Design a binder for this molecule. Structure first.
Ligand SMILES: *[C@@H]1O[C@H](CO)[C@@H](O[C@@H]2O[C@H](CO)[C@@H](O)[C@H](O)[C@H]2NC(C)=O)[C@H](O)[C@H]1NC(C)=O
Ligand SMILES: *[C@@H]1O[C@H](CO)[C@@H](O[C@@H]2O[C@H](CO)[C@@H](O)[C@H](O)[C@H]2NC(C)=O)[C@H](O)[C@H]1NC(C)=O
Ligand code: NAG
Ligand code: NAG
Ligand code: NAG
Ligand code: NAG
Ligand code: NAG
Ligand code: NAG
Ligand code: NAG
Ligand code: NAG
Lengths: 442, 442
């Protein structure tokens, strides 16, 4: 429904006394259904984008507001949306971006909760539950781990809190992406697997380069220096699809039908095919993701401040090891190269990744002492490879959604939602209301 | 006995990527009694001074090493001893002192534990227990709260983790100091209480100012501009004595006998006294603290890098509210003035205190979710006013030492140790071995 757009003055640096500069962090408040009379606060720990986007898309929060008689708070992450510490200069240099860390964001969330309990009459002694998806989920989980005095519990939806170092294998994500295509149709993964070598052949002559350009209906003519970028963009497509493999039609990044992988896997399916015919089928598949509603005239393989911030973060703290092997996946082999990644990070930002940091700060797998965190994960979501899929304790629990892609549980109810989601969404509220009840009884 | 002096390269900034500068943090290792064969690591979270000083004085650690078959680690706090990030320049400006926070110190401790488990063969899968006294105690407790993946538990000895904001009354510390003198002899507190007004009278004339100088055997002649400093120094004496009111003779800051308050309270005791005679008795009392072994010719009321660092910290994060009222204490009234304190901090360092910070970071009183922390406190220790004196849970436990001044429990055994200490020191090991056992059985 409707909310109020609010601003709160925040220190730029919570970890140092030298800078005294402030900035306004944007946040949203939805108060209908909230009962001052023994209710609760559902706090979304904002991630890598505009807070309105997360507000507009986390349906489960609005869907569960009345039942939990809650106030909804959506807190924007510093350096995203309108919550820029140095305004336009925020991405200027390594000096200006120094304050973009997960610790600074968690510290903003504590200051903001402090402010709401102080400001809103009735809030002062109410329980607050942290909710988040993807990095927002990692943030929500870490917020209960470090600030248990601020939040009673956390719902960490598709939060890959273990996608680091040697915790999980670098192959897993792409292995799951492959599994999605294989289980979505006969000879689908096999078709994609064979496609790379076929693109490589055609990349050899200028005539083949011209043919490829037309077959794929590209905007610009392919040169031989473009071939690695072309394959990267196609790989990026299959990846995207695995995260958006929803039980119903959707318009998140692109207009897409129900079970989009099943729809693309229809164009592949025939094994007895020529390399020329195989790439025509590949196009048809690309066409469903990029042009499902006649949206484009040609496919442009080339492709902002939200990606800039994420890039900085991926270059500093959030260093997730990724690789493909062509054996456990349908992709060409690519190893995880920390050294190479480090040098590109220094070139763009003038900073170097700390690949062990997150593990030293947030604990890695060693988190048994914590309580009240429900980790939900979809079976289709490649991100589940780096998440928690089995219960750590009676209070640190895992919830799997078979037929669930990237955090389906946080979406607005559809009709097409399998039992696995509704059943999980209910287990979520079950746990949330057990945290509120336990808080009020102490 | 004997230890090894070691150094470990540490990042200057753990909370930012802009600075890449490093420094060597000093640490000590005692390995006799340590069994690679299912033992433990007793880690002292270094506080506001030289690590050797803490090593030389935390007897309980060496006394319990064999029983817990442990390696002793003494980690120096950044900006103290030889662990200076910018060497001689470390205290230069507000820019250079930016990195002196409790979070940075806790982050150094995590990096150092990581290094020992990586470096020392056998350490890798052993349990580590954080030990600390005073601020070291606050640090040890906070280290289990934030890094439970690094330490199994903590022994927080005389750690005033609640000496902030409105958590406790600003009067408490000085109320306890008063109680120590009152219970240590008839008319002792009454004598000190009356002394202030008597010093004020004599401060009026130059003849009285001269008399006072001789009666107190001062080094420099008292002027009227010195009177507030004189009273401050005498107040500082009674304070010191309450923290060092030990059951046996000691030479920590000054050569002192057993129960030094009882010894000073002998010189007061007579109520039926003149103001002139009262100040002669006050001197006799000052004489036991400053000259018990003929150490000085005169008492110098005027009085370093360890105080500088502590001053910075007390000006930034560790902002503990203090006051005297003359009703619940034996002192002249002085209110807690945050505004005044803030301006003096800006004048000396160019920084302003954040009086609510520690509470937002470490949780204040709201710490029930944490586990395995034993808070010991002495009954005489004025610092116990801001500490934990009753059990929060079965695992967050309080231990009181009647006849115990400032962290008596951490000292080397004497013979003169009351049952209350030995009984508490044993309950400490009881809990410590329950954390090691539980770790090994999982
Ligand atoms: C995107 O989808 C639409 C419709 O499927 C395509 O638009 C067609 O354009 C062709 C040639 O330019 C015309 O003959 C027709 O007007 C369109 N067909 C239909 C059925 O509407 C468009 O070319 C698609 N594919 C790509 C790669 O852009
Ligand atoms: C500190 O203690 C000693 C001993 O109690 C004092 O030294 C005395 O000095 C006086 C005068 O200067 C001499 O007559 C004697 O040599 C000392 N007496 C004894 C018993 O040794 C000293 O003055 C004390 N008090 C102060 C305030 O300094
Ligand atoms: C949010 O959705 C509303 C309508 O539901 C729309 O006006 C707006 O464009 C959306 N904003 C974002 C950032 O998605
Ligand atoms: C591929 O070819 C062979 C024989 O020509 C056949 O046995 C098999 O069923 C074929 N499959 C498809 C999907 O065409
Ligand atoms: C492709 O997309 C980018 C990104 O906005 C744009 O700047 C570029 O000019 C585009 N070219 C074509 C032919 O679509
Ligand atoms: C942390 O967990 C891991 C694997 O989950 C285990 O092997 C390890 O030894 C645990 N704890 C410590 C303190 O080393
Ligand atoms: C530590 O004690 C030893 C002897 O036990 C001594 O040589 C040294 O002066 C002491 N150092 C400190 C800093 O107290
Ligand atoms: C103080 O004086 C009175 C009478 O002169 C007496 O009752 C009381 O015991 C005295 N106490 C001391 C310690 O001199
Ligand atoms: C008093 O102590 C200080 C601190 O070291 C010193 O600088 C000063 O000159 C001293 N004066 C006397 C008379 O003791
Ligand atoms: C924190 O503890 C205090 C006093 O110890 C209590 O009144 C308070 O409401 C507690 N928790 C919250 C979340 O407000």
């Amino acid at each position: 429904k409707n909310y109020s757009v609010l601003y709160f003055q925040q220190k730029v640096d919570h970890f140092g006394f030298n800078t005294v500069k402030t900035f306004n962090q944007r946040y949203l408040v939805a108060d209908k259904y909230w009962k001052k009379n023994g209710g609760s606060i559902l706090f979304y720990t904002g991630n890598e984008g505009d807070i309105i986007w997360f507000c507009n898309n986390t349906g489960f929060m609005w869907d569960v507001a009345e039942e939990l008689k809650a106030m909804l708070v959506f807190a924007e992450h510093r350096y995203y949306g309108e919550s820029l510490p140095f305004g336009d200069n925020s991405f200027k240099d390594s000096r200006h971006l120094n304050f973009l860390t997960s610790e600074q964001a968690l510290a903003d969330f504590a200051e903001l909760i402090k402010h709401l309990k102080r400001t809103i009459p009735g809030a002062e002694n109410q329980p607050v539950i942290a909710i988040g998806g993807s990095y927002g989920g990692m943030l929500a989980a870490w917020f209960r781990m470090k600030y248990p005095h601020m939040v009673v519990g956390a719902l960490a939806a598709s939060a890959p809190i273990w996608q680091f170092e040697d915790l999980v294998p670098c192959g897993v994500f792409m292995k799951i992406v492959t599994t999605d295509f294989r289980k979505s149709g006969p000879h689908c993964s096999e078709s994609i697997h064979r496609s790379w070598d076929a693109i490589n052949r055609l990349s050899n002559t200028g005539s083949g380069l011209q043919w490829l350009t037309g077959a794929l209906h590209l905007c610009s003519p392919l040169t031989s220096q473009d071939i690695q970028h072309l394959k990267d963009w196609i790989s990026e497509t299959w990846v995207n699809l695995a995260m958006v493999d929803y039980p119903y039609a959707s318009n998140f990044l692109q207009p897409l039908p129900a079970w989009p992988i099943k729809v693309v896997c229809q164009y592949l399916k025939n094994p007895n095919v020529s390399d020329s015919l195989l790439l025509q089928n590949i196009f048809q598949a690309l066409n469903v993701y990029y042009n499902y509603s006649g949206q484009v005239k040609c496919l442009n393989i080339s492709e902002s401040l939200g990606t800039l911030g994420w890039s900085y973060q991926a270059c500093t703290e959030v260093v997730m090891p990724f690789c493909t092997n062509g054996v456990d996946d349908m992709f060409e082999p690519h190893s995880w190269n920390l050294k190479e990644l480090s040098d590109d990070c220094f070139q763009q930002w003038g900073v170097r990744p700390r690949p062990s940091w997150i593990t030293t700060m947030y604990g890695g797998k060693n988190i048994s002492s914590h309580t009240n965190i429900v980790f939900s994960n979809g079976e289709l979501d490649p991100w589940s490879g780096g998440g928690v899929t089995k219960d750590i304790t009676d209070t640190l629990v895992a919830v799997t959604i078979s037929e669930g892609a990237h955090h389906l549980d946080l979406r607005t109810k559809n009709a097409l939602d399998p039992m696995s989601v509704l059943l999980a969404r209910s287990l979520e509220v079950r746990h949330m209301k057990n945290w509120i009840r336990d808080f009020y009884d102490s």
